[PDB]
Amino acid sequence: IGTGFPFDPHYVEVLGERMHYVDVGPRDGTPVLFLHGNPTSSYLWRNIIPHVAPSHRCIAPDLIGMGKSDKPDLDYFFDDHVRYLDAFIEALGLEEVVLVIHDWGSALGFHWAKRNPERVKGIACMEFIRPFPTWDEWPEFARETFQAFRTADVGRELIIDQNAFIEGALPKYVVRPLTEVEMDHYREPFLKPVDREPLWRFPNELPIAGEPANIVALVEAYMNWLHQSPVPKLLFWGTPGFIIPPAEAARLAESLPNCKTVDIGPGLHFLQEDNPDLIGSEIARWLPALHH
Ligand SMILES: [Cl-]
């Protein structure tokens, strides 16, 4: 599995801040917009993009405060990411897109899709955010971890002071062992502890046990949208998975319209690190029928 990042840098000024992005592939078709989540960056897509670039433009931003994007002193609420990603999409003059989304990038992407339904020609998703109505519905072995992340003071000590999301959660939720070179790519944006604010706010935004109410409501709304939308969907899932267990992937395959599901094999949360070649090849194969 490749560890390099052989993509020329691009930066765009968004809300007074520079945002970094990958931009490869032909200019004259529907772009494919790749959205990472926590605590990752466009690096997460590095081995997937090359499968898609031959046929479509591939755009993969680093969310504000992450990757090689600038680091304003924000609270880094989901709403802050919404504001910056909306403005990124417009700054690039995008019209119609295909989304490829994961984790908080999936909350961003589904929320954008719900608000812009005529501009989304397909959604490939994996390990995406849905409401967790109670803590018993969160993966059992990660309940303590995430309860502590969301606990006054303690969560900041773990994630900001001790870098627990990068050094702990990220490799824990990849089945194969991440190499030191890969870890260094993920560590680089966060070498200064104070710059870890997004990494702490994100788990505090997760829609778990009804809190925070604004996120629970907007995630319920995009899921209601998704359940009645005819947009083509491509859902990748792994075993045992993490926030999309195999039985949930099967439920979604039946319930969501026009949804194709692909088993990637072993996987927890960062499925892209366990089987990027199948994810990329299946996205590439699925795109042509979306054009018409
Ligand atoms: Cl999170």
From Swiss-Prot:
Its EC number is 3.8.1.5. It comes from the Bacteria. InterPro entries: AB_hydrolase_1, AB_hydrolase_fold, AB_hydrolase_sf, Epox_hydrolase-like, Haloalkane_dehalogenase_2. Pathway: Xenobiotic degradation; haloalkane degradation. Keywords: Detoxification, Hydrolase, Plasmid. Monomer. This is Haloalkane dehalogenase. It comes from Rhodococcus rhodochrous. The gene is dhaA.
